[model samples]
Target chain A: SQIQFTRHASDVLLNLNRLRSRDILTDVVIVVSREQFRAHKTVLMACSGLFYSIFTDQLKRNLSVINLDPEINPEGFNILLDFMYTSRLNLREGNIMAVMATAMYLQMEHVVDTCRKFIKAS
Target chain B: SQIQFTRHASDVLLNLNRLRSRDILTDVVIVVSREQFRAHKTVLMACSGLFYSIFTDQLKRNLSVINLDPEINPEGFNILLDFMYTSRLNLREGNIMAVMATAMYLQMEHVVDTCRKFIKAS
Candidate 1:
């Protein structure tokens, strides 16, 4: 047997790391204004309900290159992209709404919870 | 600017997921009873001071597999290995001491803290 898995949602999630890059299993490309990011499809859905809805629709699928405009802040989304894999964000210092806004756009609830905890505790 | 990052240490962490495999920048390998795992030296050192001393000295460094026998469980170390990337572990609905023990052996304080929080809150 593969052994029994547990209650934390993150436990199941750690496996997503295996899907880290395009060569192995990445299926979609999320292109921002200044940059383009490649990531796994299942992960986007697991981490963001918004992405779930967006990808689920047949007509909307380009099957490649999810281009974003200036409003998205490409750099902040870099951190958000990393979050999908590790469920972690490297917030250096000071207040950051761009990443939060990107999280909100993606409807990433755990990211919201982490953000709230940081706010409440800080 | 790369932006002012905040207090969360996991913030800097998502980068380790970049070290997802040995073909990448990984410089070390950890051998358990049944298998061997390739990982990043900086990550292991950052995550565990024990691995630090184990790898830091002369001759002790074969610059290859750090073989650990009987005491450390390999399957449990799988979750611990994943935890090194995401700082997240999925503990199912039963008692699990192996993961925690391995975490302690690695001196992964965050993993230890997560385990305690799970115990205290549960």
Candidate 2:
């Protein structure tokens, strides 16, 4: 028999964020507009195709620091990262555009699609 | 307005397992009896209190290898690890006891509870 614990993924994501908050076991540092975000590479690659390509293409190098497109808004990228780790996207009238643009740049289709719907509704 | 992408966690977990299967970006190795399991420390600690304590209590040391209790059934531990990465637990009449014992040893309350129910039903 198989028992599916539906909440397990959510719980794991929450704890992953907790670990990020405490800056524990983070292997990669991302820079956007000179702001630094420390994160797990596996988590980032798991969530974004852009990240998967970035890491997989350069597998020969043990990358510790990555510089995102300087044009990317740090706040927006932060929101996306938060979503990636916590599975929740909090957008407002003020931040939706930035968040959406960041998602587009990261090639996160679901988030981009969500932001598009939110924009259309508003 | 806010957008909650409920499927993001599930997607991330699935990709995490893919990374584990490919043996990419895993930071720690767990030795159970004679078998070794490679996994992300952040993921393991997020899913297991025993791992959280084990990691936090020794933060000063950058641990790369962990040795589980020698008595832990590797097959059971493997199932628990799969559940940790995928949120689905597959139990058979032959494997339930080992899985439950492994979950108990890891202090994973949810897995332990699910195993108890499965055992009671059988």
Candidate 3:
């Protein structure tokens, strides 16, 4: 059992920083595992489920076309994985909006789509 | 002759932090003198002139109400003054945008309007 660390926002940011520094998180498996490890495996599993919940909720609310395509770019995926691990990604306005759109399309629906709507309204 | 301190963005931020911590920058005289001293008098004088130019430019640009009123709020003034002195105010997004707008109106024309427009566009 790899310490079973409970994911705090700070820890997620730190892990993101680590992955960014290493630059080894090029492929899907490594990036997903990194997220799982940083978040604790349980939270990682929960996040996947949450994505589905997000899609369902958005659909119910008549917000179809969430737009979170995970395959946006390998580099962007790395940024997202880093966010999952360290929760402290300092995204600029344009990038944040772009990533949110990508996440919405990918059906990582909650994190991206909700944030997009919020930003637009705000 | 006062030693002229060239105003850098970093210096303005430092001065602001000092004022915020001291909590005694209450009156106009103290604040103005403090700015003059930090910016080496010459720059301070230039800033005053710059404020006027800002107003004129805005007027020419068809921006009728530039809101350069120095009488907005003393605390806010202190924050701007601090930025002028130290040049490193760690403002949150909302507050940063507000200060930038205030600076634009005050005829501190270059300092405030550019800063505000930059934030808006970016």
Candidate 4:
């Protein structure tokens, strides 16, 4: 028996997309396709519990040089990163599955729902 | 007893800030001071019942050019537009009142609530 109070965010972290432009923040640079992408730690904190812990609680390292996760599917991450920054997901036949997989893995339920709706409709 | 169905939007139209970029899908142009900002019709529709009616129901005319609302406080609109786009507001003594008034006039409850909280603290 469990008593739980879960506040579901309307549209989830998609609601927080403004943080991308507003936080005026900095973090270790991520090398994405050799282009420098300025990422906010708040977003990392918001989206990934694992990364958040690693960045803050565990390592607590002010590491400036960080590689873009090479193992992350670039095309998929391209859409996911764009989703984080732009609050959009251009889920098409080509990229929908990749994006959905990444969304699930990242625990971004908004994108996961979007992918579901796309699947349900199509 | 009057039972009403009122769905309170989470954080109000702030959720729609992403529409600033994601809904590139735009209509008319809004001139903000010296700069012209490309605006999507949808944000107006979501934020202002007046503008929504003016744009959608009554005036369905394809009006292209729009002047920056001459009467609206420039600083206020500046912050509001930035908030509309980026979902961040820097509420200082100078601009907060203007922004709250404009947010009230425009019926943007999210900004209004933000202003109230800011004032509540200080």
Candidate 5:
């Protein structure tokens, strides 16, 4: 399930390589930057059967504008990685709070907005 | 806060003694049997100022009617003890499911009903 996807993402990409690989998952569609699009392209090419059109251009831009430092944003990275691999949104309160903090710290406006909406709904 | 309460309950009551001690926190209201009411009385006498008028006589009877065996009903007992000590309701899906099963097996109709309502809301 989602856990498998997370393990794959964690295994395939080294900690230092994540920033470089961010585009591997981000750059496929026409809306996001070529760099971001490339990441999406790679994933789509590698796992075409599992690919789904969820990230829109606006969302890509939202991700791009955020300044996430893996060293400082481990929690956010964990949550993001979990989401990308699993498409699962279920989170314990502590994890959700940590993810929110990470999103806020990195200034990922779109992510922060989405999490806020989720928290409100929850 | 809730975790602390859970730990405290786990520590204070041994696994085997749970069923026998169920009344420790259950008996106080005039409606329940003396045995069940004594449990409430103990908790009230021990925790005094912290006690709240939440568990009613009907709730006590509801608890008594349930056939909870500590060895088999650990999860339900855990959830119940957590509620008694912390009054917190937040729970993960897995924990909630387990608690529901335990409550059902024990024939704790009131607990089962409450758990179902909580799960539905979540």
Candidate 6:
């Protein structure tokens, strides 16, 4: 009746990252502490509630640059961006708190919850 | 050390479809027969090898409209588009051939192979 390909999503996500790397179809720039990362609004909106809110706003059409708070840890934010595109998060006890703070700032509930779980387990 | 979100890809795929529905970030139009489907180049390139080739071409920057062959079955094309975004394909004895043909034309090896396996199973 229906065929489900288990790897389809992963495949697509991998390709999305490929496109991002080549800067092929990236539409938005995320600036964290002056370090800029190019990404797609679609990926950001789908993964982060804060991004969803921003991109869904009335003036979303003209929003090409998004600046994060100066205090946001750039390393954690970059890690979250990697996880957003790859579905894989690498965390260590030392960096978990910083990543969690960045996750909370971005309103990525999955990342936030995972950070909590990892903290508890550690 | 690492956290893998099993549903991350699925969630992102689902939201990509949601964005497509709203015509939010769609970047390309695929014309099959007389019908036009709005989609993102990133999604198309990620899903089909033919699309990947087209998008990676030197002149790919300006390609916003892609027209399929005149003989392409709209129904099967639409079905494949659905699967591209959702990872689920519905096949029946009556429609599988058309779907397989469309998959071949798109150079979607996964879809072609799946159709072959499905036909063999049936």
Which candidate wins on DockQ?
6
Q: Write the per-residue lDDT of candidate 4 for residues B20-70, one digit (tens) a residue.
A: 454323455766566566664544543454454555543553566567466
Give the deviation of candidate 1 from the true structure as CA RMSD.
11.3
What is the per-residue lDDT of model 5 for residues B11-43, given as tens digits with 9 covering 90 to 100? 222221242254322333422222222233322
Q: Candidate 5 at A33: error in angstroms?
A: 87
TM-score, model 1 to reference: 0.45
How close to the true structure is residue A22 of candidate 3, measured as C-alpha lDDT? Answer: 46
**Judged by lDDT relative to the true structure, which candidate is superior, 4 or 6?**
6
What is the lDDT, from 0 to 100, of the residue B16 in candidate 6? Answer: 95
lDDT tens per residue, model 6, B26-67: 889999889899998889989998899998886875588998
> Fraction of reference contacts reproduced per prediction?
0.00, 0.91, 0.00, 0.04, 0.00, 0.85
Best by TM-score: 6
What DockQ would you assign to candidate 5?
A: 0.01
lDDT of 3 by residue, B1-122 (tens): 01111221223233333433443221123233223122222122223444324422534322222233444544455555554444334345556666665565445564565466557765
> Candidates sorted by lDDT, descending order?
6, 2, 1, 4, 3, 5
Kindly list the per-residue Cα lDDT of model 3 for residues A30-102, writing each as its tens digit: 3332232122221222234443354234343233223333355544455454544443333455566655654
Worst 10 contiguous positions by lDDT, candidate 3 chain B: B1-10
Which is superior by lDDT, 2 or 6?
A: 6
Write model 1 residue lDDT over A18-118, tens digit each, in one string. Answer: 43542234557788776878776545654576766676666653365566656787877888777666556765434356777777888876666666666
Evaluated against the true chain A, what TM-score does chain A of model 2 have? 0.94
Residues A1-122, model 4: lDDT tens digits = 11111221222243334333442224446555655555544444444443445555435545555565565566776666655544345677777787788667666676677688778876
Candidate DockQ values, in order, are 0.03, 0.80, 0.01, 0.04, 0.01, 0.83
For model 3, the DockQ equals: 0.01
Give the alpha carbon lDDT tens digit for every residue of A1-122 in model 6.
77899999999999999999999879999999979999999999999999999988768755889998989998999999999999999899888999999999999997899898898889
Q: Which stretches of candidate 3 lie over 4 Å from their true place?
A: A1-43, A50-71, B1-122
TM-score of the second chain of model 4 compared to its true counterpart: 0.64
- Report how far residue B77 has shifted in candidate 5, in Å: 1.7
